[PDB]
Amino acid sequence: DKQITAEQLLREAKEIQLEDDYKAPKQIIT
Amino acid sequence: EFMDLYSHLIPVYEIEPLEKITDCYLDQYLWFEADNRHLFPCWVKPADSEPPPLLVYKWC
Amino acid sequence: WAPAIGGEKPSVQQSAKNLPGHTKLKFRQTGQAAEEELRAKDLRAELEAKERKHFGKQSGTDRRWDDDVVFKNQARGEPKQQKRFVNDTIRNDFHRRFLQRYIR
Amino acid sequence: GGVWKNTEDEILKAAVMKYGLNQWARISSLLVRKSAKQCKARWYEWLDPAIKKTEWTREEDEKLLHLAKLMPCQWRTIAPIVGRTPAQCLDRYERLLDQAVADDPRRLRPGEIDPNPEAKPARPDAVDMDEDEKEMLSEARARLANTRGKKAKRKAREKQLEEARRLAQLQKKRVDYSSEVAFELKPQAGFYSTADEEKTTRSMQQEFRPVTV
Amino acid sequence: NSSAAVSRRIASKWPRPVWHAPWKMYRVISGHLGWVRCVAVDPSNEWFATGSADRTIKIWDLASGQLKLTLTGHIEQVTGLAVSSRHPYMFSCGLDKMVKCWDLEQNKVIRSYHGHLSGVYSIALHPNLDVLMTGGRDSVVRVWDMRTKVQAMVLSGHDQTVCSLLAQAPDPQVISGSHDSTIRLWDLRKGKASAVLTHHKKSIRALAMHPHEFAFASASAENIKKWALPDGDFLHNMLSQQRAIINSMAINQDGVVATGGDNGSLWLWDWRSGHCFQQDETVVQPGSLESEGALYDMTFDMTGSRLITAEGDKTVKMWKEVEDATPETHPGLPFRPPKDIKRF
Amino acid sequence: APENLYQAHLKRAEAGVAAAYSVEDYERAKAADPEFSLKYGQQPKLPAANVEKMVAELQERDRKKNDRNAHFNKKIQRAF
Amino acid sequence: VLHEDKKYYPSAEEIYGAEVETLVMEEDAQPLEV
Amino acid sequence: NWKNPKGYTIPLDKRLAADGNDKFAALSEALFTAEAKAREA
Amino acid sequence: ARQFEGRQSKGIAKTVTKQRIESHFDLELRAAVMHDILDMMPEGVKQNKARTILQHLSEAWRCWKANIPWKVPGLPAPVENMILRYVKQKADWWTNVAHYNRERIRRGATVDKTVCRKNL
RNA sequence: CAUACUUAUCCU
RNA sequence: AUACCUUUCUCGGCCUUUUGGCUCAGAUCAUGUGUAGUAU
C-alpha cells in the first residue's frame, strides 16, 4: 500500500540520529 | 586480466559462465561441422593430427 | 599540511657515512676552466666559432605468377617513421613500441 | 540468482549514493542474493539515471535502424549512438522488425536461466515481507547510517569511571599546567606601563565565583 | 619624502631604458622525460647541465645543443644545479632531500650532503669559500662544508620553503627568498639574518644578482623588485607586471634581466630602468598541454649572449640576441616613464 | 564589505561619541591638559568611567550578535 | 582512410618554424668514462 | 567516485555530474550489395 | 652512546629509500601543488580552498589511471590547468617507472615481489 | 516456541 | 485625531568542513556443527 522510496528512509536514518554524542553530565562542581 | 610471462603479457578474458557454456558448445559444434566440410584446408595448421614437432618434421 | 621545520656535549654516535672520505678538494687547474685562465680569452669568439662550425657543418653546404592476386601495391603509401619527440605520456613512440613489445 | 525485487533496486540506489560507482562489492554486500557483477549490471542496464526509460521517439527509431544496418549486430556500439541501452535498442529493433512482417523457439522457457535479469524492471515489493526482505532492509538501513567507530563509547564511559574514582578518593580524604604557565610567552614591553594591569589580572585569578561546566 | 613627491621626482629623473637588442629563440632540445627544472652553465662556457623531473642531469654542448652525457643519481626531481668555478664539481639538489657533489673528472657522485628534512629547492656555491648553501621545504638554509660534507650552519627563520638562494663574497653572503614571502639577507659568520625584507606579497621564487652591481632582483607572482646591497634597500619595482608566477630570473652583464613565468612567458627587462623591452610566450613542444608550459630555470651562458631556459614541456630552449638589430630596426616595447602619481 | 563594515565602523564611532562623551567633557579634560606633545606612552588624565564605557560599548555589540552530510549538500543547493 | 598510424600533433618543425633548430637528444654522445 | 572517508551520501547525479563516422555506411552498403550480387549470381 | 645519551630520535633526516619512494613522491608532489596554489590565489582570496584543490588532484589522478575524462563544471581554469600539469607529472613518473620495472622484469633483474604485481 | 549472532568452550 | 519617523519584529539566509595522504580501484570478498547466552 505504501512502497519504499529512498528519501523517506534517508529521513528515517536521520531520525536514527547517528551518534552526535550526548552532552557530558552536569555534575555539581565545587 | 593480464598473465605475466615476464617478457610479454597475455590477455585473459573472463566470460560469463552461462555464456561460456553456449560458447563452448558453439566452439565444438563449429569445429566438428567445419571438419566435416573441410572448411579449412590442410595448410591451416594447429591441426589435430599432428603435434607441433610433427609439424616441424613434416615441413622438413 | 605543514612540514617539519629543520632548525639546528655533542653526541658521540658516529655514522658510517660520516667517516673521513674525499678529504681534499679538487681545484680547477690550468686547463680545466680555471678563473685566471678564463679572463685571458674571449669566450664570445669561441662560442660564435663553435656555433658557426656546428651550424654550417651540419648544413653540409658552402602474365606473371601474381595474376590471381587481389591486392597489388599495398605497402606503397605506408608512412615511414620519424625521430620525433612527442610530449605525451601514452601517445609517444617509445610507449607505443613498449606496449607493442610487451603485450601480445 | 533471479530477477531484482524492487527493494533490492532501492538498496542498490541508496548504496550508489553512499558508496559511488566503483564499490560494487561493497554494494554487493547489502544484497545477499546479488553479486557485485549483478549490482554493476543492474546499475548500468536499468538504474543509471542517465537511462532514458521514456517511450521511444521516432527520430530514435530511424537512428536505430540506420545503425542496425551500418554496424550489424553490434548493439554495444549502436546503443550509445541511439542513446538507449543495448537491451532497449535490441528489443526495440525486434519490435520494429516484426512490425514490418506483422510456441516460439525464441522466448524464455519455464525454468530456464534468464540471461539479463538486470535489464528487466524490478519486481515490486509485495503485500507481505520476509525476514529475508526485512533483515536485508534492516542491515541496509544500519549500514547506510553508520559512520562511527566503537571506542568513542568507551570514551565517555571511561571518563565517568575516572570521575567516580576521583569522587571516591575525595570521600576517602574527607607538566603541571597550574603551578606554571605552559611555555610562557610574556607580552613584550611597550610604551605604556602595565603594572596596574598585572595587579588586576591577579585579582581576577583570585576570584572564585561559582561557575558550571 | 612622500608617494606624490617621489612620483614627481620619478617623472623627472627616471633612468631611461638602455636599448637592448631583441632575443630570439633559436633552439629547442628535446630528450628530458620530465620537466626540466634547473640549468647550470660551466665556467668554460662549453656545456650546460640540466636537471629534470625525470631525475637525471643531462650535460649538453652549449654550441651544438648535443647530449653529451646523462647522469642518474637522484631518486626524485633534480631541483637545483650549481657548477663550481673553482672546483671540477657540479652540485645537485633534489626533491629526494639529497644534495650531491659530482666529480666531473669521474662523472660520479663523490660527496653527499645529508640533512634536509624535506625536498631541496635551491642551491648556491659560495664563490670564494668552499661552502655550499641549500634551501628546501624545511624552511632552512643549510650551509655545508664542501670538503667534510659537514653541515656547518643552519640559517633559520624562514617559515616556508626556501625557494631561491644567492651567494656572494661580500656581506650578505647568502640571500634567500622563501615561500613565506620574505627575503633574508644572512650574516654567514653569525648564522643570523642581517635583514628580513617583507615587501613582497607572494613567494619569492627567483633571485638574481647583478653581475657587476651591488644589487639583486627578487621576483614574485606579483612584482620583480630590485634591492641595493648590503642592507637590502628597496630600489624599485620593474615598471610593468609580468602577470605570472616568476619561477626564474637571470641577469646579464648588459643588464638584460630575463624573467620566466610559470605560464611560459619570458620577459626581457632593462635592468637600471626597470622597463621590459621584450615579452614572449613559449611554444610548447608537440604533445604538450599548454598547461604544461612553465619556465622553471634560465641562465645566461658565461658571455651573456645566450639564454638557456629549462621548461615544463621538457625542453631546453636557447635564445640568442638578434644582435644585428639596431635601436632603429628593433627598439622593442617602448618606454613611458613612471609619470603617474601613486601610493607606494 | 570593508566599505559596508567601514560605514558600520563609523556608525560605531559617531554613535559612541554621541553616547559616551560630550563637548564640555572633552574641553574641560583638555583645559586640565595643555598637551593635546612628546608625551607618548604616559597614560592621560581621564575619568575612570571612560574605561567601562568602551567595555560596555563593545559588550553592547555582543548582545546584538547525517549531520555533516546535510551541511555539504546545503552548500550545493545553495550553489547549484 | 587514416589508420591507427594516426598523427595527434604537428611536428616540432610546424610548431617552432623553419628558423628554430629542433633537436631530439635521446642518447648521449659520450660514455660515462669520458 | 572512489573515495568517501566521511561516508556522506551524495545525490545520484551529484556524483555522476561532477567530473563526468560516414564510412560505416559506405562499408555496409558495399558489403550488402556484394551479398546481393553474390547471392543472385 | 644510545645507552647513555639515549636515542637521538629527533629530527635527524630519514633517507628516501625504496619503501618510501612513492609516498615521498606524493609528499613532494602535494607540497609542490600547494606552493603553486598559494601563489596563484589573488591577494584577498581565502587561502583555505587548497585542500579541495588537492582533493581534485587526487581525483584527477584516479581518473587518469582509470582513463576517465573529467570536467569539474565550476573549476577555475588556472586551478584546472595546475591540476592537469601535475597529474601529467605523476603520469609521466608512473609510466616511466612502469617502463623501467618492465625491463627489469623482462631481464630477470631483481625486483620486489610487489613490483611484479604493481607492474602487471 | 522459530529465524539469526557469537565464544581459545566442545566435537566432526 | 492624523501624519511623521522611527523603532520593532519576522522573514530569509549562510561558509567552511569533519573530508587519513599514498599503492597493485592497496588486496580479497566467502563453502561450519553442537550448546548456551541473548536478541526476535
Side-chain angles (χ1 to χ4, degrees):
Chain A
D1 290 345
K2 316 180 199 167
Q3 221 160 20
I4 328 202
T5 59
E7 305 176 2
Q8 43 176 180
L9 306 177
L10 301 177
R11 289 162 190 173
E12 291 173 0
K14 293 182 179 180
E15 290 173 359
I16 289 181
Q17 328 277 22
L18 218 101
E19 272 148 301
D20 315 327
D21 285 342
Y22 299 96
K23 190 172 185 176
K26 300 180 181 181
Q27 307 174 2
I28 301 182
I29 292 181
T30 86
Chain B
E1 209 211 308
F2 277 91
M3 212 212 289
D4 197 5
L5 305 194
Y6 302 133
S7 58
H8 56 109
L9 313 174
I10 293 303
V12 196
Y13 298 88
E14 177 189 286
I15 280 85
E16 223 58 70
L18 214 248
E19 272 155 36
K20 282 241 257 317
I21 280 149
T22 319
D23 288 5
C24 214
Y25 170 91
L26 223 218
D27 152 50
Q28 310 267 350
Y29 175 74
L30 281 176
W31 272 112
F32 171 73
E33 255 11 272
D35 287 43
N36 293 6
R37 272 128 175 128
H38 208 218
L39 202 225
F40 304 111
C42 289
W43 74 64
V44 7
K45 213 24 144 240
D48 281 348
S49 33
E50 63 255 58
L54 173 55
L55 210 229
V56 177
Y57 184 87
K58 272 164 199 266
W59 253 95
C60 295
Chain C
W1 295 141
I5 299 240
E8 204 154 37
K9 347 197 199 74
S11 91
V12 314
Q13 288 204 80
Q14 162 80 81
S15 163
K17 316 201 171 178
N18 288 0
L19 290 139
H22 300 273
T23 50
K24 41 207 199 93
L25 293 162
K26 285 174 188 183
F27 294 91
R28 278 183 191 265
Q29 298 311 331
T30 318
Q32 358 211 254
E35 291 173 310
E36 76 285 341
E37 142 194 354
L38 265 153
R39 312 178 227 217
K41 70 186 56 194
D42 183 69
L43 282 184
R44 229 182 210 88
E46 355 215 286
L47 170 62
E48 317 307 285
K50 279 169 313 204
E51 292 218 320
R52 140 176 3 112
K53 155 172 105 72
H54 163 248
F55 270 118
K57 264 167 28 85
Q58 75 151 332
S59 192
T61 300
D62 212 8
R63 29 100 179 140
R64 268 144 62 204
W65 54 301
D66 52 306
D67 54 63
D68 228 325
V69 163
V70 170
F71 300 99
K72 299 304 203 293
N73 333 305
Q74 289 294 320
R76 312 166 48 264
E78 75 199 23
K80 269 65 60 140
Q81 197 58 298
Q82 306 118 288
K83 167 176 226 204
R84 57 160 65 212
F85 203 91
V86 171
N87 197 18
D88 207 310
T89 312
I90 56 165
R91 273 154 203 108
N92 55 102
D93 271 348
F94 180 98
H95 191 69
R96 293 194 40 108
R97 290 188 248 113
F98 175 88
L99 282 183
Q100 232 183 63
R101 179 196 210 299
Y102 287 108
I103 311 244
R104 305 237 304 242
Chain D
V3 79
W4 288 70
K5 326 289 190 134
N6 176 86
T7 182
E8 280 167 321
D9 287 30
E10 298 308 301
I11 308 147
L12 176 55
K13 287 149 77 135
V16 170
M17 313 185 44
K18 147 139 236 282
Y19 283 130
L21 276 183
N22 288 296
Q23 298 240 68
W24 295 113
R26 193 152 263 169
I27 297 186
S28 150
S29 266
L30 305 169
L31 321 184
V32 273
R33 318 212 323 251
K34 304 287 169 258
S35 67
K37 288 161 74 185
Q38 309 189 263
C39 303
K40 189 169 181 230
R42 183 50 132 172
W43 184 262
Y44 284 109
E45 287 297 288
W46 203 240
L47 315 171
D48 194 13
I51 294 193
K52 328 176 190 158
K53 298 192 226 172
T54 77
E55 216 67 337
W56 270 66
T57 312
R58 201 213 47 269
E59 168 221 352
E60 276 185 330
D61 294 25
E62 90 149 349
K63 231 195 309 191
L64 176 127
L65 301 148
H66 188 45
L67 290 180
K69 67 175 130 77
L70 287 212
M71 285 158 327
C73 283
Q74 294 161 66
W75 295 107
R76 260 282 156 208
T77 295
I78 286 161
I81 318 171
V82 173
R84 311 309 203 115
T85 88
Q88 289 177 7
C89 283
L90 190 42
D91 57 33
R92 177 53 165 175
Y93 166 89
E94 307 250 1
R95 288 293 198 250
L96 299 184
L97 255 279
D98 298 63
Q99 273 190 34
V101 58
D103 214 65
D104 194 21
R106 300 142 75 275
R107 255 169 61 144
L108 223 319
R109 278 282 85 211
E112 220 183 83
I113 309 109
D114 180 56
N116 207 203
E118 290 77 32
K120 295 162 183 207
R123 212 67 71 90
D125 300 273
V127 287
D128 42 14
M129 39 68 65
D130 288 66
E131 284 78 20
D132 313 60
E133 194 203 78
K134 277 332 207 223
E135 283 337 275
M136 160 171 83
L137 267 175
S138 215
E139 180 211 20
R141 215 171 276 119
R143 230 187 92 174
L144 269 160
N146 217 268
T147 119
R148 191 73 240 214
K150 296 78 62 203
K151 307 254 275 171
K153 307 332 116 184
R154 311 188 143 72
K155 186 178 305 177
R157 271 62 71 168
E158 194 65 7
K159 86 181 63 179
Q160 191 61 348
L161 304 59
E162 186 67 349
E163 300 298 0
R165 176 286 304 189
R166 166 108 302 180
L167 178 51
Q169 93 162 201
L170 96 68
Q171 187 58 350
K172 291 182 174 59
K173 288 181 172 55
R174 185 75 58 84
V175 194
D176 185 342
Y177 294 135
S178 316
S179 318
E180 83 187 63
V181 188
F183 313 103
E184 204 211 347
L185 241 28
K186 277 182 146 170
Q188 68 144 241
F191 300 114
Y192 295 89
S193 201
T194 61
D196 304 11
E197 313 292 357
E198 176 66 0
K199 301 179 61 179
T200 302
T201 308
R202 285 198 284 187
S203 300
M204 292 186 177
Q205 97 69 12
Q206 287 181 358
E207 305 178 7
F208 287 97
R209 290 190 175 184
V211 176
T212 69
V213 177
Chain E
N1 279 320
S2 315
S3 320
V6 159
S7 309
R8 292 183 301 258
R9 271 204 80 194
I10 282 167
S12 322
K13 310 169 158 40
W14 208 254
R16 273 215 136 254
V18 181
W19 178 84
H20 302 269
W23 295 61
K24 62 147 139 185
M25 194 218 111
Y26 69 98
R27 186 186 285 147
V28 206
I29 312 160
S30 293
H32 274 294
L33 289 187
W35 301 345
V36 198
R37 268 292 279 238
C38 28
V39 210
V41 180
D42 155 70
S44 62
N45 212 47
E46 52 198 45
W47 53 267
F48 60 100
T50 55
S52 209
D54 76 353
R55 304 160 308 203
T56 75
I57 294 137
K58 286 184 207 245
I59 310 281
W60 311 91
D61 200 51
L62 198 132
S64 35
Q66 217 250 331
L67 188 49
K68 295 171 43 143
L69 188 59
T70 305
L71 302 175
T72 68
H74 282 274
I75 301 141
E76 227 172 307
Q77 295 199 17
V78 185
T79 55
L81 276 180
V83 182
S84 208
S85 272
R86 301 154 54 223
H87 320 261
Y89 288 161
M90 193 176 59
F91 293 82
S92 76
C93 55
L95 286 190
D96 41 85
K97 326 173 199 201
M98 275 325 310
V99 189
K100 308 182 160 175
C101 176
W102 303 78
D103 210 329
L104 299 173
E105 311 185 333
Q106 302 179 39
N107 301 342
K108 281 179 179 215
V109 164
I110 51 132
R111 305 188 173 92
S112 260
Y113 303 87
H114 172 79
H116 277 279
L117 273 34
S118 320
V120 195
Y121 272 67
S122 40
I123 196 156
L125 319 174
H126 200 289
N128 271 69
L129 312 181
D130 308 304
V131 159
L132 64 147
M133 271 82 44
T134 55
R137 296 220 281 112
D138 36 314
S139 319
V140 113
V141 187
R142 295 182 142 110
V143 175
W144 311 98
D145 198 18
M146 273 177 46
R147 207 183 46 87
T148 55
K149 296 112 106 137
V150 146
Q151 209 197 262
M153 209 163 255
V154 179
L155 307 180
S156 274
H158 282 302
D159 289 299
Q160 295 157 64
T161 315
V162 174
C163 277
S164 34
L165 265 186
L166 293 176
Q168 67 178 343
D171 273 311
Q173 290 159 257
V174 182
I175 296 156
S176 61
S178 179
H179 246 261
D180 75 342
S181 316
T182 73
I183 303 156
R184 292 178 167 245
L185 318 178
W186 301 94
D187 179 22
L188 197 51
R189 282 177 234 109
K190 287 190 232 154
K192 246 47 149 193
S194 66
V196 191
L197 310 170
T198 61
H199 301 213
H200 283 273
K201 281 173 173 177
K202 298 292 190 178
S203 101
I204 292 106
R205 291 192 189 199
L207 296 183
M209 267 263 195
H210 199 263
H212 312 289
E213 287 157 59
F214 210 26
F216 71 98
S218 40
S220 274
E222 127 264 349
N223 258 314
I224 303 132
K225 301 174 185 280
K226 166 157 153 205
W227 307 88
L229 287 155
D231 291 316
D233 309 288
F234 176 69
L235 288 171
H236 70 95
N237 296 325
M238 297 325 249
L239 300 192
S240 211
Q241 283 174 303
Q242 201 165 350
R243 269 126 79 178
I245 290 149
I246 270 85
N247 289 316
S248 34
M249 198 156 49
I251 300 166
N252 213 3
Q253 312 98 14
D254 311 322
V256 178
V257 188
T259 61
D262 191 65
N263 65 327
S265 71
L266 168 70
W267 291 27
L268 301 176
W269 318 74
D270 191 23
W271 175 276
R272 152 109 353 89
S273 68
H275 145 87
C276 98
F277 66 92
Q278 197 169 340
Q279 298 174 15
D280 271 285
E281 278 291 342
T282 50
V283 196
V284 287
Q285 68 167 310
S288 330
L289 229 42
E290 227 81 59
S291 333
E292 273 230 328
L295 221 171
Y296 294 118
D297 218 323
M298 54 188 36
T299 196
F300 282 109
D301 75 333
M302 306 302 306
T303 82
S305 36
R306 301 316 191 238
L307 182 75
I308 307 130
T309 71
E311 325 252 341
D313 69 332
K314 317 159 150 93
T315 49
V316 190
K317 274 144 161 148
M318 288 180 99
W319 297 70
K320 53 184 208 206
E321 218 155 0
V322 189
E323 54 43 71
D324 32 310
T326 42
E328 319 89 30
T329 74
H330 289 120
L333 311 163
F335 174 85
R336 303 89 176 65
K339 285 232 161 305
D340 274 75
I341 296 196
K342 35 158 79 140
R343 253 169 81 213
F344 290 124
Chain F
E3 289 283 31
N4 220 34
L5 301 103
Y6 163 36
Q7 53 246 1
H9 212 260
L10 198 146
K11 252 61 159 61
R12 289 314 162 257
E14 270 273 67
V17 66
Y21 298 94
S22 91
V23 53
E24 80 113 21
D25 219 330
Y26 279 140
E27 192 115 18
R28 298 171 312 83
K30 303 315 233 160
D33 199 317
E35 315 291 69
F36 48 61
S37 181
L38 284 49
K39 55 91 154 183
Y40 185 69
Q42 41 205 72
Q43 187 162 20
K45 328 297 164 265
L46 298 136
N50 295 168
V51 204
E52 306 272 36
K53 295 190 185 169
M54 182 205 26
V55 193
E57 202 251 350
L58 57 88
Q59 308 268 28
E60 198 31 57
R61 153 185 331 150
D62 305 5
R63 307 96 166 81
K64 179 268 147 175
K65 169 183 31 141
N66 51 92
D67 179 290
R68 305 132 279 132
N69 173 20
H71 278 301
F72 196 148
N73 314 51
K74 277 172 167 191
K75 103 192 260 159
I76 285 322
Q77 318 314 281
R78 236 177 299 181
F80 297 57
Chain G
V1 195
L2 54 144
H3 264 193
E4 249 249 329
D5 57 50
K6 191 204 203 270
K7 269 300 124 173
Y8 298 92
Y9 314 101
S11 12
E13 300 80 50
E14 317 167 37
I15 281 310
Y16 290 105
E19 69 311 331
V20 173
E21 175 193 22
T22 275
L23 314 185
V24 191
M25 294 294 155
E26 282 171 311
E27 56 107 58
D28 321 334
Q30 75 207 39
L32 195 80
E33 299 90 52
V34 189
Chain H
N1 278 259
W2 292 272
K3 249 58 210 155
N4 201 351
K6 301 285 136 212
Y8 300 162
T9 276
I10 311 267
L12 238 10
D13 201 278
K14 231 164 279 296
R15 273 197 191 279
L16 267 69
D19 37 290
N21 202 83
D22 49 301
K23 296 160 135 132
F24 282 100
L27 184 63
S28 315
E29 282 160 15
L31 273 174
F32 290 12
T33 122
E35 294 219 26
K37 306 212 292 194
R39 195 171 304 121
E40 210 82 43
Chain I
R2 226 213 295 130
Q3 210 64 36
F4 282 90
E5 307 166 341
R7 183 144 19 222
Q8 299 315 150
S9 233
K10 37 205 68 178
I12 159 133
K14 216 75 167 75
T15 286
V16 184
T17 66
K18 264 201 351 277
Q19 84 185 200
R20 279 167 234 140
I21 269 178
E22 263 170 341
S23 68
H24 193 80
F25 181 90
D26 280 278
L27 271 183
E28 284 315 298
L29 198 277
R30 294 190 129 223
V33 179
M34 277 296 300
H35 282 357
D36 276 47
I37 289 174
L38 298 193
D39 265 13
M40 257 171 220
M41 306 277 102
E43 200 213 293
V45 172
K46 189 207 53 32
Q47 268 199 0
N48 310 344
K49 282 300 241 171
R51 187 169 213 298
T52 72
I53 302 166
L54 278 179
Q55 291 177 347
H56 280 288
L57 166 90
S58 298
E59 251 309 281
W61 176 240
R62 302 174 207 130
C63 292
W64 187 82
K65 270 223 279 212
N67 209 34
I68 298 150
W70 59 282
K71 200 83 226 203
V72 187
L75 245 198
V79 177
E80 207 229 10
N81 286 339
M82 197 205 42
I83 281 149
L84 296 169
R85 145 201 301 204
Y86 277 97
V87 164
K88 184 148 174 198
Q89 214 225 207
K90 200 168 170 159
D92 292 342
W93 170 70
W94 186 96
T95 305
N96 289 338
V97 175
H99 293 161
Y100 173 86
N101 284 335
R102 200 52 198 201
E103 317 294 4
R104 307 200 101 235
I105 292 177
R106 193 214 74 239
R107 289 200 317 259
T110 179
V111 317
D112 183 2
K113 193 51 123 40
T114 92
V115 167
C116 275
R117 260 187 282 132
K118 295 168 76 106
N119 201 262
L120 184 72

